[PDB]
Design an enzyme around this catalytic site. Structure first.
Site, PDB file in Angstrom:
ATOM      1  N   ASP A 158       0.719  -1.284   0.201  1.00  0.00           N
ATOM      2  CA  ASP A 158       0.123  -0.140   0.087  1.00  0.00           C
ATOM      3  C   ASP A 158       1.226   1.166  -0.068  1.00  0.00           C
ATOM      4  OD1 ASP A 158       1.127  -0.804   2.549  1.00  0.00           O
ATOM      5  OD2 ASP A 158      -0.996  -0.271   3.849  1.00  0.00           O
TER       6      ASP A 158
HETATM    7  C1  LIG Z   1       7.392   9.357  17.748  1.00  0.00           C
HETATM    8  C2  LIG Z   1       6.002   8.323  17.889  1.00  0.00           C
HETATM    9  C3  LIG Z   1       4.958   9.604  17.661  1.00  0.00           C
HETATM   10  C4  LIG Z   1       3.866   8.579  16.356  1.00  0.00           C
HETATM   11  C5  LIG Z   1       2.784   9.335  16.680  1.00  0.00           C
HETATM   12  C6  LIG Z   1       1.591   9.759  15.693  1.00  0.00           C
HETATM   13  C7  LIG Z   1       0.612   7.795  15.872  1.00  0.00           C
HETATM   14  C8  LIG Z   1      -0.509   8.745  14.196  1.00  0.00           C
HETATM   15  C9  LIG Z   1      -1.113   7.588  14.028  1.00  0.00           C
HETATM   16  C10 LIG Z   1      -2.625   8.003  14.318  1.00  0.00           C
HETATM   17  C11 LIG Z   1      -3.340   8.519  12.613  1.00  0.00           C
HETATM   18  C12 LIG Z   1      -3.852   7.971  11.344  1.00  0.00           C
HETATM   19  O1  LIG Z   1      -3.517   6.424  11.975  1.00  0.00           O
HETATM   20  S1  LIG Z   1      -4.209   8.082  10.224  1.00  0.00           S
HETATM   21  C13 LIG Z   1      -5.520   6.745   9.896  1.00  0.00           C
HETATM   22  C14 LIG Z   1      -5.403   6.275   8.788  1.00  0.00           C
HETATM   23  N1  LIG Z   1      -7.097   5.925   8.858  1.00  0.00           N
HETATM   24  C15 LIG Z   1      -7.457   6.785   7.697  1.00  0.00           C
HETATM   25  O2  LIG Z   1      -7.307   7.396   7.038  1.00  0.00           O
HETATM   26  C16 LIG Z   1      -8.821   5.692   7.011  1.00  0.00           C
HETATM   27  C17 LIG Z   1      -9.105   4.873   6.018  1.00  0.00           C
HETATM   28  N2  LIG Z   1      -7.660   4.031   5.709  1.00  0.00           N
HETATM   29  C18 LIG Z   1      -6.627   4.225   5.086  1.00  0.00           C
HETATM   30  O3  LIG Z   1      -5.955   5.370   4.426  1.00  0.00           O
HETATM   31  C19 LIG Z   1      -5.256   2.914   5.413  1.00  0.00           C
HETATM   32  O4  LIG Z   1      -4.515   3.654   5.284  1.00  0.00           O
HETATM   33  C20 LIG Z   1      -5.158   2.408   3.769  1.00  0.00           C
HETATM   34  C21 LIG Z   1      -7.089   1.908   3.817  1.00  0.00           C
HETATM   35  C22 LIG Z   1      -3.816   1.903   3.850  1.00  0.00           C
HETATM   36  C23 LIG Z   1      -5.135   3.161   2.692  1.00  0.00           C
HETATM   37  O5  LIG Z   1      -4.652   2.677   2.155  1.00  0.00           O
HETATM   38  P1  LIG Z   1      -3.017   3.513   1.488  1.00  0.00           P
HETATM   39  O6  LIG Z   1      -1.568   3.904   2.173  1.00  0.00           O
HETATM   40  O7  LIG Z   1      -2.457   2.399   0.182  1.00  0.00           O
HETATM   41  O8  LIG Z   1      -3.540   4.636   0.769  1.00  0.00           O
END
Ligand SMILES: CCCCCCCCCCCC(=O)SCCNC(=O)CCNC(=O)[C@H](O)C(C)(C)COP(=O)(O)O
Ligand SMILES: CCCCCCCCCCCCCCCCCCCC(=O)O[C@H](COC(=O)CCCCCCCCCCCCCC)COP(=O)(O)OCCN
Ligand code: SF4
Ligand code: SF4
Lengths: 383, 90, 84, 135, 199, 45, 216, 119
Positions: free
Chosen positions: C40
């Site tokens: 991905d």
């Molecule tokens: C020092 C350490 C500190 C870290 C803190 C930071 C952590 C931040 C984590 C929170 C941010 C999020 O999760 S953001 C939320 C992410 N989830 C969504 O947006 C819903 C839609 N699903 C997607 O986007 C998926 O990634 C996918 C299906 C694989 C799309 O495939 P691709 O990818 O090919 O595009």
């Protein structure tokens, strides 16, 4: 040239400040707060209305009964409770004693931060006298829990007004000998004149209140515009200055001590005889002799000290001219014996937000003067 | 110039535990000792909220609102400040 | 053409080899990140960051978003005038 | 009010009072007069024409301006207008300028554009002392 | 005095403003320019040769020769009242029976939840506690428990000097509170003979 | 006639719950716990 | 910038008769008639300014909060210059569980007003930083305590809670004592956060009478 | 093409750009590498891969941003990273296919009468 800002960390030891300087001149100030945030707004949802009252003493712990006042008034408005005349007079008298205590501490702590050490030691003995006045009526020097819904907790003991008059007879002399060290002194003037200027438009835009607002030429006192208890009967003046200076705020605070002395003298001569508590027995607990002799009083004592009264559903916001400005409580009632939501509005929270626009163009040795002249206590700032 | 620190018996001559005159504190009104009925003074439970008719086709006349306002210095009327909050006689 | 087309290719294979979600023998000199290798967007970003770590560059978001293949990555590194 | 300065200030001279409270330094260094109030109120009366004729907002603004101008007309001295409208004239000119500034934003938002069967519920409060105390 | 001067201005914008414009002469809180020789000499004797520092110095020298307000603790004490809220204590009747009857009102009113109570019936049928704890490190010393008690069993006595070296010494159980009451009973009764006129 | 607790603030609470646009707010399953910020094992109970 | 000191004598009055009558009686109808699309509901109740009066509460949509607040600040009859606070109240039984509440004060005519907006957890409320300068820290605190996102804010970051604090404490489903607690570890030589353990758990007293009529 | 504007990969790229400064400032040079840190932060993102609402995605990205500046401004030290970020990941990938044939149920049975709360 392309001069980057030099930043500075100002004190873990409870105000944290992150300054930016362009040499000796400050360009930005960002206060970091929450080092005294104890979550009292969440804890008040788990208390009954009498249980949550001593939380308010610990918000502005330089001015305790004034913090109690607004919470009590907010409950009384939704309950539709009337306070008797003697209780209103007692509340006004102790509110003005509280204002005198707060202004003594604020001016002398400011002058100690600037560098003058003697006025602190001179004013704290007067503070000790007023603490003895708190203790003789409530048994606590600071956290009195004296003001209750419908009146005050106990009556004044015999011999209190005599001693309050004896203190008020010499307090003007104490304020006079305080001003001989500071008012006509060039070092104090050179530290305070034209430092941190607040105009009227900036004062209202930044939610200011109290002696800041009066030093910018605004005639606004809540004890004269939206009076509460017997403040409408009181005869006193509103001091007005017009520069918005630290020096002008210092002069306004001294004059407000004089006017509080005037109100105290008026309350000592017009104190009436009568009830000090509201006679609604379903809100106010009975006397201890009545509880030990009648069945209805014992039932009401049992229920008021366990479940408490039920406040009818509704909302209100009630404010008091606290000695640092407008202190307000937003009470939300669903109908239970516990507050559904109790938002606390503090004036020092709004006054500390201004430090970014007040310290611009000043030097490092004027930050402590600005913080001292805003009159901030972090219990009410960090709830 | 009034002196700080008064000398003996000029301030707090009697301790609060040795009050020279016995105190008789009223805890009830004489009007309520033998007349104890409560529903005539139940202010807590007698307030009402009423849903107004839906404020749509009302007639706000601004002419009446500005016709009751003064135009000269005298004939200006001011609401006096309330001396005390309601005590209901107590 | 700022650098050769063989040593960059084996360096690309060398950094593609240490990926836990990739197959160490399925990797070909001309493949795809999506249909073939099954990655991905975040896996693609991680692989491009590994390539950046190995070749000492900085690839912006749009340029790394255009890279979708092993051959695309090799051609981008070869066309870069600041490669190591 | 009480002046915190230990010097003796007249305060019957109105320019001294406007200096002392910071009106000159902080709000307007140019003294406001009756003619500037008339000009600002006529600016509001010109600016409100961007609102529709049948709107209650236009009627409200126009009635306020007409009353203010009638007060300005029937009083010649500026102290009389101060005593009637309960402000300084610098405040009143600022009020009129702010009211004129408000009009394009309200007109862009168009609050009058509600349907014909628009409905707003209102809940009113009745005190207990209406039915408990003496009529 | 509260008068201002061009030059004594603490900031820079006002310092720049006073030396390039005469707008400060309109302001009534400023000191005016001297008009003749004697006024110039008065202004110079104000600025040079101080005389404003000297008034404060004369006041502090008068305070050096004045009376002092210090008490010699612990040979001398402060002043308190019969309403003073100090160390909690449990009381008895003059016969020697406990006043407490395990009603659990003081436990219900306590805003700090500093009271823990368990009870059962005694072997003579009486209603008495088997556990009565007060966490003194949770207590806020409000006195609400003293108000809620209908038999005057729990009080806040006149003791304020009870600092310890371990925190386990400040988790009071029932036996220590009865010991406190047996220690302080006469003083508590003297205080309550006055405070019963008001309560 | 209609009188169902028609003398208290609960009239002003039943409406303000049916204000348009805010009376139709809806989220997907488990979505409010992701934005709540409390530990995710709490929702296994 | 109003309520300049003008009278040098003692004033024994509050407001004028006509403006106080207008503010205490006609202000609700006035605001509804002049700007009807901004108002969705109104309550006239027990008066923030004093115990003796009545004062309005205005309900509005988030799409028109900024124009309504600009109108309430700048209109000649409603000069609400001071914003005293911004807060929220949680109602978990509703579809939109939050009510964002704005209190205002008019120094010109001794009045007060209250403005409410209803949103759920994922609907942004427009910021009032450009209208009122105090709206910054209050919106930061409301985001910190309830999780209400204010769009267009310059720097929406937490202001009150701990540095790594996730979770919004003033919600009804958040525990009073929380999830984590803090102690010093001699082995790690650091102050460490650990899952909550209590020596004495909190005792919840359920006092509520089954005859009580006021519960709503 | 990428759901909700591809904001997840843009935020992931921003954090990956921010990561070596975190490693230098927190002095984690000999504890974890940048590759495993990138894999860990990637594993934080996959937990919300099934979010169907864009507003939840925007809120999650805003909260993750505020977490990354509270790590940047030294408001959480290296032991916070140890006890909250990398050891939960190593515990979730270290206990897989353990040396004992006990089921997770039997380990839970022998531990206590109730499930564990928190970490
Ligand atoms: C020092 C350490 C500190 C870290 C803190 C930071 C952590 C931040 C984590 C929170 C941010 C999020 O999760 S953001 C939320 C992410 N989830 C969504 O947006 C819903 C839609 N699903 C997607 O986007 C998926 O990634 C996918 C299906 C694989 C799309 O495939 P691709 O990818 O090919 O595009
Ligand atoms: C024991 C310790 C003794 C000291 C105790 C008091 C400490 C005071 C410290 C602060 C002093 C302030 C100070 O010196 O101010 C200056 C004036 O005084 C001075 O300059 C004072 C020093 C000089 C004394 C007077 C010299 C001239 C006398 C007559 C000479 C000609 C006739 C005889 C030949 C400048 O302050 P400013 O406001 O004037 O600054 C003009 C621009 N703002
Ligand atoms: S004095 Fe207050 S804190 Fe102490 S036990 Fe009594 S109610 Fe609890
Ligand atoms: S001390 Fe008094 S209030 Fe407390 S349980 Fe005993 S009798 Fe009841």
């Amino acid at each position: 040239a392309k001069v980057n800002n030099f930043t500075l960390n100002f004190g873990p030891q409870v105000l944290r400040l992150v300054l930016e300087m362009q040499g000796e001149i400050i360009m930005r100030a960002d206060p970091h707060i929450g080092l005294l945030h104890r979550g009292t707004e969440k804890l008040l949802e788990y208390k009954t209305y009498l249980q949550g009252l001593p939380y308010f003493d610990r918000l502005d712990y330089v001015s305790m009964m004034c913090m109690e006042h607004s919470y009590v008034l907010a409950i009384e408005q939704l309950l539709n409770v009337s306070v008797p005349l003697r209780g209103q007079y007692i509340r006004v008298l102790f509110s003005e004693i509280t204002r005198v205590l707060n202004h003594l501490l604020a001016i002398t702590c400011h002058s100690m931060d600037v560098g003058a050490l003697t006025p602190f030691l001179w004013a704290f003995e007067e503070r000790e006298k007023l603490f003895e006045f708190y203790e003789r009526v409530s048994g606590a020097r600071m956290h009195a829990a004296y003001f209750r819904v419908g009146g005050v907790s106990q009556d004044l003991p015999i011999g209190l007004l005599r001693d309050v008059y004896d203190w008020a007879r010499q307090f003007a002399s104490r304020l006079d000998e305080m001003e001989e060290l500071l008012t006509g002194n060039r070092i104090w003037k050179e530290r305070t004149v034209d430092v941190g200027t607040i105009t009227a438009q900036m004062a209202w835009d930044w939610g200011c209140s109290g002696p800041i607002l009066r030093a910018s030429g605004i005639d606004w006192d809540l004890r004269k515009t939206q009076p509460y208890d017997a403040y409408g009967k009181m005869q006193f003046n509103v001091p007005i200055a017009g520069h918005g200076d630290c020096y002008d705020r210092y002069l306004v605070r001294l004059q407000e001590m004089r006017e509080s002395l005037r109100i105290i003298y008026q309350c000592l001569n017009e104190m009436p005889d009568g009830l000090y508590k509201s006679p609604d027995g379903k809100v106010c607990p009975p006397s201890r002799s009545t509880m030990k002799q009648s069945m209805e009083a014992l039932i009401h004592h049992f229920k008021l000290y366990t479940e408490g009264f039920h406040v009818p559903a509704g909302e209100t916001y009630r404010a008091v001219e606290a000695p640092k400005g407008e202190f307000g409580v937003y009470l939300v009632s669903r109908g239970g014996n516990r507050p559904y939501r109790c938002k606390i509005r503090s004036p020092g929270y709004a006054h500390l937000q201004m430090t970014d626009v007040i310290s611009r163009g000043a030097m490092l040795a004027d930050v402590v003067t600005i913080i001292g002249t805003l009159d901030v206590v972090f219990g009410e700032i960090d709830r | 110039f009034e002196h700080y620190l008064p000398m003996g018996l000029e301030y707090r001559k009697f301790s609060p535990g040795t009050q020279p005159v016995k105190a008789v504190v009223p805890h009830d009104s004489p009007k309520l000792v033998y007349d104890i009925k409560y529903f005539v003074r139940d202010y807590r439970r007698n307030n009402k909220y009423t849903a107004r008719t839906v404020d749509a086709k009302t007639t706000f006349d601004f002419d009446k609102l500005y016709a009751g306002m003064p135009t000269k210095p005298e004939q200006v009327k001011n609401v006096t400040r309330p001396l005390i909050m309601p005590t209901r006689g107590y | 053409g700022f650098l050769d087309k063989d040593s960059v290719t084996e360096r690309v294979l060398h950094v593609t080899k240490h990926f836990e979600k990739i197959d160490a023998s399925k990797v070909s000199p001309a493949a795809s990140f999506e249909k073939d290798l099954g990655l991905d967007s975040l896996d693609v970003v991680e692989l491009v960051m590994a390539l950046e770590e190995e070749f000492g560059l900085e690839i912006p978001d749009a340029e790394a978003d255009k890279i979708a293949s092993v051959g695309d990555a090799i051609n981008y590194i070869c066309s870069n005038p600041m490669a190591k | 009010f009480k002046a915190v300065a230990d010097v003796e200030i007249d305060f019957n001279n109105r320019e001294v009072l406007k200096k002392y409270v910071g009106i000159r330094d902080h709000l307007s260094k140019e003294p406001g007069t009756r003619g500037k109030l008339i000009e600002a109120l006529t600016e509001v009366l010109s600016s409100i024409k961007a609102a529709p004729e049948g709107s209650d907002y236009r009627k409200a603004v126009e009635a306020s301006c007409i009353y203010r101008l009638k007060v300005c007309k029937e009083n010649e001295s500026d102290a009389a207008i101060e005593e009637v409208l309960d402000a300084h004239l610098e405040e009143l000119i600022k009020e009129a300028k702010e009211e004129a500034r408000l009009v394009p934003l309200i007109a862009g938002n168009a609050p009058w554009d509600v349907p014909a069967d628009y409905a707003v519920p209102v809940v009113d409060y009745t005190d207990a002392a209406t039915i408990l105390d003496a009529p | 005095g509260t008068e201002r001067r061009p030059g004594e201005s603490g900031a820079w914008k006002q310092i720049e403003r006073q030396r390039y414009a005469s707008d400060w002469e309109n302001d009534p809180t400023f000191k005016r320019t001297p008009k003749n020789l004697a006024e110039v000499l008065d202004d110079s004797a104000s600025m040079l040769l101080l005389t404003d520092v000297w008034r404060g110095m004369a006041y502090t020298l008068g305070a050096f020769f004045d009376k002092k307000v210090t008490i010699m603790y612990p040979f001398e004490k402060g002043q308190l009242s019969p309403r003073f809220r100090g160390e909690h204590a449990l009381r008895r009747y003059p016969t020697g029976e406990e006043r407490c009857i395990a009603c659990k009102l003081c436990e219900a009113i306590c805003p700090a939840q500093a009271i823990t109570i368990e009870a059962e019936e005694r072997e003579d049928g009486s209603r008495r506690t088997t556990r009565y704890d007060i966490d003194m490190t949770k207590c806020i010393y409000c006195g609400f428990c003293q108000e809620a008690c209908p038999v005057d069993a729990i009080v806040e006595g006149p003791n304020f000097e009870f600092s310890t070296e371990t925190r386990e010494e400040l988790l009071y159980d029932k036996q220590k509170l009865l010991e406190n009451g047996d220690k302080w009973e006469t003083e508590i009764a003297t205080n309550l003979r006055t405070e019963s006129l008001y309560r | 006639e209609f009188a169902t607790a028609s003398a208290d603030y609960s009239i002003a609470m039943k409406k303000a719950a049916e204000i348009t646009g805010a009376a139709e707010s809806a989220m997907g399953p488990k979505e409010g716990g992701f934005t709540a910020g409390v530990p995710l094992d709490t929702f296994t109970r | 910038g109003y309520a300049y000191a003008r009278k040098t004598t003692d004033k024994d009055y509050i407001a004028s008769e006509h403006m106080q009558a207008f503010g205490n009686t006609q202000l609700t109808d006035y605001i509804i008639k002049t700007v009807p699309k901004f108002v969705k509901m109104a309550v006239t109740g027990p008066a923030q300014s004093s115990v003796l009066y009545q004062e309005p509460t205005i309900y509005t949509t988030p799409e028109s909060l900024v124009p309504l607040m600009v109108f309430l600040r700048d209109h000649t009859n409603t000069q609400f210059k001071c914003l005293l606070d911004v807060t929220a109240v949680d109602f978990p039984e509703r579809a939109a569980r939050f009510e964002v509440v704005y209190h205002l004060l008019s120094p010109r005519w001794n009045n007060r007003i209250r403005v409410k907006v209803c949103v759920d957890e994922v609907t942004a409320v427009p910021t009032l930083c450009k209208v009122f300068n105090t709206a910054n820290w209050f919106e930061r605190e409301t985001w910190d305590m309830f999780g209400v996102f204010f769009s267009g804010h310059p720097d929406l970051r937490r202001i009150l809670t701990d540095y790594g604090f996730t979770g919004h404490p003033l919600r009804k489903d958040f525990p009073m004592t929380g999830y984590q607690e803090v102690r010093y570890d001699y082995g790690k030589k650091r102050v460490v956060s650990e899952p909550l353990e209590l020596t004495q758990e909190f005792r919840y007293f359920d006092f509520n009478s089954p005859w009580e009529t006021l519960n709503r | 093409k990428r759901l909700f504007g591809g904001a997840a990969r843009h935020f992931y790229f921003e954090i990956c750009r921010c990561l070596p400064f975190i490693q230098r400032l927190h002095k984690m040079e000999e504890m974890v590498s940048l590759k495993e840190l990138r894999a860990i932060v990637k594993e934080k993102f996959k937990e919300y891969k099934d979010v169907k609402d864009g507003r939840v995605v925007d809120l999650l990205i805003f909260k993750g941003r505020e977490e990354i500046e509270t790590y940047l401004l030294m408001h959480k030290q290296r032991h916070h990273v140890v006890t909250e970020v990398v050891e939960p990941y190593y515990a979730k990938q270290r206990a897989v296919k353990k040396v004992t044939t006990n089921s997770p149920f039997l380990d839970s049975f022998l531990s206590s009468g109730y499930a564990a709360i928190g970490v």
